[PDB]
Design a binder for this molecule. Structure first.
Ligand SMILES: *[C@@H]1O[C@H](CO)[C@@H](O[C@@H]2O[C@H](CO)[C@@H](O[C@@H]3O[C@H](CO)[C@@H](O)[C@H](O)[C@@H]3O)[C@H](O)[C@H]2NC(C)=O)[C@H](O)[C@H]1NC(C)=O
Ligand SMILES: CC(=O)N[C@H]1[C@H]([C@H](O)[C@H](O)CO)O[C@@](O[C@@H]2[C@@H](O)[C@H](O)O[C@H](CO)[C@@H]2O)(C(=O)O)C[C@@H]1O
Ligand SMILES: *[C@@H]1O[C@H](CO)[C@@H](O)[C@H](O)[C@H]1NC(C)=O
Ligand SMILES: *[C@@H]1O[C@H](CO)[C@@H](O)[C@H](O)[C@H]1NC(C)=O
Ligand SMILES: *[C@@H]1O[C@H](CO)[C@@H](O)[C@H](O)[C@H]1NC(C)=O
Ligand SMILES: *[C@@H]1O[C@H](CO)[C@@H](O)[C@H](O)[C@H]1NC(C)=O
Ligand SMILES: *[C@@H]1O[C@H](CO)[C@@H](O)[C@H](O)[C@H]1NC(C)=O
Lengths: 174, 321, 323, 174, 323, 177
């Protein structure tokens, strides 16, 4: 995709995540589990649904009567009808096929953008209190527990509360 | 040995595939098709109005009253007309119907239709009205069209006809009449006595004068003779003036016609399905909001656009893994 | 601590655009690419005034219906304006052969001049005073002004053999006709000769018409019919007339030069003294937009007609609330 | 396709930046104020106008005369013209609605990308001399006056003048 | 200093330029054009079938057998008919061919064509078949159509014809006949001796009655008379019945005709190229897989979509940097 | 561009790199040279090739016969054909022209994105072991030989090994020495 997340530095999706399109996986002392980001998922679901409906609802269908009303001595006019019908089929076939091709690439790159933005949202909270692993994961420096883990997904991560512990852990490795 | 939180995306067991402009055969978690491929395989009503199904007859054969057709029917309204690909019953006596294709388009959608007896056979006291032919059999017996009468000589005389019918009905009237072409001088004198004949029809707009063409012709349905029919729309309070001295196939019935919509003739071999639809094809009916379909090109109604394609699949989920 | 911030523009605009994923998105600037305004008047097309027939139809104007204008200037026109139901089409009941194909030819005419080609003085042995009650001028019977109703003179209708060679340098449009009698007695009472014929011949035309005597309905108080014909006579070619009755002699012809094509516009409006590149029956439109939704029946270089109320392109940024 | 800047980590626009589409707001001892970035603004305006002109000017229009030139005995030919006229209306209507829908999303992402690139360009200059607050703002560790502020806007920021001053301030943060 | 690693992209000497929605004249490293603008400028076979090229003949003058037109040879099958815009030899004797355009559409694609003799000249023992006109010259000496026979009175008498030909061939037959229109009664009597005459033709579907229009007409090709020609398709095991007492242009040669596809007539002034093509234009043939072209609108075959475009250049590379 | 890599912080292409579309340039004590990233180059070449093929192959072409077979007394029907052929020309010209414009825009952002992804893959690897110059380059805070150079390219860079060496150099520039 255009952005680096899906099939990029986040190599593959999560089969263990059945709720939501995007979310988090945590691993700490208490345990490990998945959690869906309902804000990102519902926003994406609404966006894709609008896209499909817009493609469907924008079609203006009219009452037409398509038949063969010309006899043997009117082949030229029948040929005129054939050229008209074939031209419309060529236009609609080409239009529908490439509209699907163009929108599918944009849809897959839409999911890629959403995952990367969610990754950036977490990265903004953590700052130097955690270390980026480069594969979509953050290694904590300050022993983040279950209540701590929720604050990252909530958006309520208390950075100054853990600055001292992370700093002392950062110097230990160095 | 440090705590970890990760960001990831959904995956499932879906094997659905989509195509992008850069990549082909990409497995996605969810996909939606926008191409219609299903029909009920039946002939339905169009917006609550039943179609006119001619089981074994053409429009010309049904209009003139071929004895092998269904007499008449209690359908005063139809949205479109159904015909088989090769109807068995048509003009049984060989001939032509003028403006047949234009007439078929006129009757494609009809609000009100009613057969009306406008000139009974009793209105022909000086002429014979029992004309029949083997080319128009009924239960193996020679017969004729049930709405137009073969006027022929009686008591060795064919007096000149001066007849006018005024349209007293409140609706438009569709009238059919024909002329007969003989094969030899003896046949003409046999059937109509007078050797030189004509048919003169006149209305507010119509001014016609047909002359029989007596010549050697190939046999069709056994008869070398021909019968060319004509039609017109008699407006209310307008009178049609017939004037002939032979070879005249005089109208006996007519048709009250009210038209406010248009349609076409559908060539389908199916049968009625006691259903309703907004879109009809010769092989079935469609219900759909999808913008495209690949079922049949010869559709009637509000239908998806016809395309050459087997699938139009839109990716709704994520890139699966 | 000093701070620097990144940000974008926001304003008081309430313009809304739609995207494939979102609906009713407020933006700061936007452009409408759909044309929806027309001046509501009939203009010239590329500087050429149209032909406007207020109460008259194409057949009546050409043939010379007395209640139609005798002649107004308009030596050339870009298109023709006809009313939906013209009041004076054919005073004497009848038909004009290939009326639509003639209307298409006269849609755009580079030069139009009426010409006298056969004056009334060229019928020395035929009465040329024929009139009808279905064709009234000022309350008295009259006839078409460009054709002559030839009747018998001194109980005689000599067989006519008259030819006209087109000496003009431009194409000539000539209209003639045949009269249908109500009965055999009326045929004798008008043209004497019982069995009549009208035969017209040119380099490409070879015509022979026979009157059809029958009983018909009454139209405009008359029961007979007058079927009219026409042709385009090229320069240096002659048209040959030959009839012994029921002949409608042509008196006035039409010099014609054709350089382009147009169509017939059914409109109830009148002249607006304006100029346009795209005309519709309810008004002219002046825009460079690629799409419009005003009327399908357009003449000229026009935007593509669409079924849509608005096509708004977002040019600004997504907008923020009041603060 | 969202890049996260507009309606993202930068929440809302400024009504006080009446000079350009994208710009900066500074705050120091000398005071505060807005400053448009001409380079990004003029580039965006030229590209957007090209889009509008490309959609308009690429349309081909030729002289056509459209009327009802058929009688009641040529209804089959009329239905052919009716089938053709309705067919072209459905093609143009569907394309115009979908092209506007598709390009409107492109334009909104274009503005989002420009703001993010503007944010990124500032960040590359400042490095550790300032800290990122996450709301699109940078807190300077060193003292940055109006002359300093103008250097960041036009890309002429001199990192090594204030490294020690920012380093001393960074170490002083206890 | 310090060790460095840098991220970068390719660049070359290409000056190729593409257009984007937002930018104009953008140089790229590699580009591909999807618009076809080249042709061989020759008339090729359409899927291996040779076209029927009438070098100085209109279609009508080719079936009827114009004396200055049979420079041609047997072409049993063709894929399209190539006519010049203004062929020199259309109809040597002035007249018309009924339903000419529909007949031309019929013969555009023919699976099998074979001229066959159906009525030899010996089949008129009591009629004159040596009718010859100066309007139909061959090598200067007057001649006539090679496939039809001008029947003239013999021994001061024109016996009434009652002739029938049955299509015993297993293919359909294209039969052409005609009627001669005279200018005066003396010409009528001197040629056919019967003042009032008729030509009646009948088949399983056809019922025709033609009467000459003895009238004065403008001279064309030296003749004031005309010859209206008619055609029909005779189904296998069917017979055509002729009954005439004068002015009959009897058929001599017919055509065994099999139709399996449809095409059109191409107006071009070029010659054969001994080549095969999937798409043919009046100015040359196209061998391309591209979806669009701007060579010629009047195409025959499986062709790309016609557009008004000088170039449609897709960017297949990176944004190039000047050297 | 959209992602800011091409014509953004990275200025200009490399005339000296001919082995691929996206690559690296290194400079150390042993020397300097270019090395192409074969993965993203082939991935982008295949994607761009499919776009050209999809635009071409998706077009449906069927046999047609186009000509002028209507006489002088059928000008209305010829006018009908005239509107039809022009109407399809307008549809095809507008669709083809806009297709080129939108797709060329998207293709230019495809290369812009790929370069940015290559830059990020390196940046997240080096971290503070190297300094971002803001022009698409990384200045190493330690000695990185030819073997070290590939470890950045192939994604196997050992941060902890050089962490001590890189940390020493950071202080030297910090104290104005
Ligand atoms: C209608 O009247 C005009 C006025 O005279 C006739 O003029 C025709 O004009 C043409 C062009 O000047 C003459 O053609 C010339 O004739 C000779 C053959 O003699 C030819 O070699 C030259 O190339 C040149 O074109 C034509 O002869 C002349 N017609 C006559 C009868 O003298 C015109 O013919 C008249 N229309 C008809 C249908 O007769
Ligand atoms: C030039 C001429 O003879 N004009 C007649 C005219 C025609 O003879 C008639 O329209 C042919 O159909 O007819 C006029 O009206 C007549 C009535 O006044 C008369 O009562 O009945 C006639 C029927 O034979 C005929 O309708 C007219 O239009 O004024 C008489 C006029 O002299
Ligand atoms: C996929 O999983 C669902 C629920 O987990 C199950 O119902 C279904 O049978 C599985 N297979 C397919 C082919 O959908
Ligand atoms: C038919 O009868 C009505 C009765 O009101 C009459 O007014 C009308 O004129 C008649 N029609 C004709 C053609 O005479
Ligand atoms: C958008 O606004 C219009 C009127 O401004 C309203 O009719 C429509 O329902 C709105 N749509 C949505 C999705 O809010
Ligand atoms: C692009 O080049 C053309 C000539 O090929 C020139 O007319 C046009 O002005 C140029 N446009 C720009 C924006 O440079
Ligand atoms: C023509 O030949 C067929 C074949 O025997 C025969 O049936 C038919 O009667 C003949 N005549 C006509 C007029 O078709």
């Amino acid at each position: 995709g255009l952005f680096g997340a899906i099939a990029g530095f986040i190599e593959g999706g999560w089969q263990g995540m059945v709720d939501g399109w995007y979310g988090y996986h945590h691993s700490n002392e208490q345990g490990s589990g998945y959690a869906a980001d309902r804000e990102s998922t519902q926003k994406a679901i609404d966006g894709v649904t609008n896209k499909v409906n817009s493609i469907i609802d924008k079609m203006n269908t009219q009452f037409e009567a398509v038949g063969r009303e010309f006899n043997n001595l009117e082949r030229r006019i029948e040929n005129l009808n054939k050229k008209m019908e074939d031209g419309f089929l060529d236009v609609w076939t080409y239009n529908a096929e490439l509209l699907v091709l163009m929108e599918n690439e944009r849809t897959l790159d839409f999911h890629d953008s959403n995952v990367k933005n969610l990754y950036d949202k977490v990265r903004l909270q953590l700052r130097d209190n955690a270390k980026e692993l480069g594969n979509g994961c953050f290694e904590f420096y300050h022993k983040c527990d279950n209540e701590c883990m929720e604050s990252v997904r909530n958006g309520t991560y208390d950075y100054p509360q853990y600055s001292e512990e992370a700093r002392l852990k950062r110097e230990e490795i160095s | 040995p440090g705590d970890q939180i990760c960001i990831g995306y959904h995956a499932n067991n879906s094997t659905e595939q989509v195509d992008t402009i850069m990549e082909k055969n990409v497995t996605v978690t969810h996909a939606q098709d926008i191409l219609e491929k299903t029909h009920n395989g039946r002939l339905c009503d169009l917006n609550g109005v039943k179609p006119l199904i001619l089981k074994d007859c053409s429009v010309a054969g049904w209009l003139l009253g071929n004895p092998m057709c269904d007499e008449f029917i209690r359908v005063p309204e139809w949205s479109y007309i159904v015909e088989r690909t090769n109807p068995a019953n048509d003009l049984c006596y060989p001939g032509n119907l003028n403006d047949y294709e234009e007439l078929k388009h006129l009757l494609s959608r009809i609000n009100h239709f009613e057969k009306t007896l406008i000139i009974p056979k009793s209105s022909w006291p000086n002429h014979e009205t029992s004309g029949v032919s083997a080319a128009c059999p009924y239960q193996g017996v020679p017969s004729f069209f049930r709405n137009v009468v073969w006027l022929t000589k009686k008591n060795d005389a064919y007096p000149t006809i001066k007849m006018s019918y005024n349209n007293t009905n409140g609706e438009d009237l569709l009238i059919l009449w024909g002329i007969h072409h003989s094969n030899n001088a003896a046949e003409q004198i046999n059937l109509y006595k007078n050797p030189t004949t004509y048919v003169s029809v006149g209305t507010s707009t119509l001014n016609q004068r047909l002359v029989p063409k007596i010549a050697t012709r190939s046999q069709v349905n056994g008869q070398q003779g021909r019968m060319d029919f004509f039609w017109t729309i008699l407006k209310p309070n307008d009178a049609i003036h017939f004037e002939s001295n032979g070879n005249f196939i005089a109208p006996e019935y007519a048709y009250k016609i009210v038209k406010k919509g248009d349609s076409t003739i559908m060539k389908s071999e199916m049968e009625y399905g006691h259903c309703n639809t907004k879109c009809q094809t010769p092989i079935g009916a469609i219900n759909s909001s999808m913008p495209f379909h690949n079922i049949h090109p010869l559709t009637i109604g509000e239908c998806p656009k016809y395309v050459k394609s087997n699938k139009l699949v839109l990716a709704t989920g994520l890139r699966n893994s």
